[model samples]
Target: SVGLIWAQSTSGVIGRDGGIPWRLPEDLAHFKRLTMGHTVVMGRRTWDSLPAAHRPLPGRRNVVVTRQTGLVAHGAQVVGSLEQALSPAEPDAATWVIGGAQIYALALPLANRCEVTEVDVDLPPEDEDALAPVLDQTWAGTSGEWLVSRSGLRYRMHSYRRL
Candidate 1:
């Protein structure tokens, strides 16, 4: 019932050198238009990963999912769980999942609309300490038709809505 936009990078790397790897202004603009006036849910680490100037992600209700103490961002609401973050969003509302890994893992099973910006580039297959959780195949087919195609830097925008 809610919309979840999973904006990703070309090499499957959401972060590189401790920050975002890509430079897609169009995707960022689209993200802004879609999420404006809605709720954007993410983990605290994701909050920290953002540039200091872009922390609150203007015009949206930011709900940060965190286990830490005293993490209160201006213009953002702090909550401990997905349910709590989602409590204020209506069923038909557009609620996005901006990730730091843990929060996306938690929301995978609960997501209704998956808007993934899929990338064509491959990672080096190296063992890395940073990683997103395993997404179960069971939840993969729960959604309906997928519209997938290429975008900037050989990445594609893939969208799947729940039936």
Candidate 2:
């Protein structure tokens, strides 16, 4: 099974009015707790967006899915396509698809758990690119009770395992 992790904000904004949405520390901490000792994958852009210190997230097999051949990710494995990313068969451990837009688009259908911040947001025209794409209603819909994470941020966690 694979999981996804993302946090958005109200205002249909992913980043701030002009920057990244939701506080990183709060969500990253959540991520560490859940994904440690598992496989975590992300697109090139998402990988590049990381701060220097957080680049090599420890305790997980970092898989960087990219079309850029020959690119180097010191502590991560490189795979070109989503299928390739999901390959290698980790039947015992869960896979987590971390993302930016393009990545989430592809990962959604395959994810078993969708950990979203359900930002009560309506994106302004300018922020279209900031938010993850609305996934197919067939593949996903929110589940579980909405809860306030420690950040005082109200959000929900949803899961989707392929039927």
Candidate 3:
């Protein structure tokens, strides 16, 4: 029921500066295809990082987790914590944690699968502000062949399933 989806740089940086530092339209399409009809739970920062035109992330159930109770994110269902956002009523339905650093770490243990894209950039250590979870010995991954983006950025997709 739970899965994690994110794109990280070679340095394991998922986000930097204000948000994701790199741009990959191809990876955006891949993310859309996978989560289009599902529920996406994300941190408030992640929700705010989206383009104004795509704030609610059309075609999906958008749930934004925030500690601030009164801050409503327009069209999204706002909840106080990750636990409340994760208690889905639909059994076996896909719930993807499309994250910022905190939410991904919180949901990591409960997620059954992970879909990750490893981008070409080897970010500097100082710029590595946000990092993706370290998948340990309990999980195994199968990576796809590398493909170059339109901007000539090389990336490879990895799908992980729990052991």
Candidate 4:
């Protein structure tokens, strides 16, 4: 099934200057644990933001949606559309639309669920829109919330299922 996984701050900022605005190691660990064996679909910018050594994210099947021709995404399946990116995952395998706002917006309608880590802090660019509210309209209600970390800043994981 299609789904999305991301984290955002209280001010509705999910990213800034092309990268995450904070160093929340706990949240990173949480993300790795959940997406490890799934098929992850992302936009070119998100793929570019990943560290060179971490490209393809190891065990997960990495699919990058990019319109750029002759692009080379090492160890990743590059496609022109989200649907094409998602096609590589087996029907029974879990699929996750992993970040960059534009990709999230495009994949939301096809997503069956979302896993969001809400950070209790404000960071800029605060005007950046979030994926949560869009997920709210598609997923409707949250299934649960759990305290993820309390190291200096508090963060909670919220799970939402499609309506």
Per-model CA lDDT versus the true structure: 0.67, 0.69, 0.88, 0.79
State residue 163's C-alpha deviation in candidate 2, in Å. Answer: 6.0
Q: Say which prediction, candidate 1 or candidate 3, comes out ahead on TM-score.
A: 3
Q: Which is the winner by lDDT between candidate 1 and candidate 4?
A: 4
Model 2 — TM-score against the truth?
0.77
Model 3 lDDT per residue over 18-134, tens place: 689899989999999999988899988899888879989999999998888745458799989888988854566779999988999988988899999999886864644998889
Write one digit per residue (lDDT tens) for candidate 2, span 34-139.
8898888888877777766777678788888888774554667889888898888677877888777678878887777667656443446463446755655556
TM-score of each: 0.77, 0.77, 0.94, 0.87
Query: Which model scores highest in TM-score?
Result: 3
Per-model RMSD to reference:
3.9, 3.2, 1.3, 2.3
Best by lDDT: 3
Superposed Cα deviation of residue 104, candidate 2 (Å)? 1.2
lDDT of predicted model 2: 0.69
Better of 1 and 2 by TM-score: 1
Model 1: residues with Cα > 4 Å off, grouped in runs: 120-126, 129-152
Give the clashing pairs for model 1.
Answer: none
Model 2 clashing-pair count: 9
Give candidate 2 misplaced runs (Cα > 4 Å): 15-19, 119-128, 139-156, 159-163
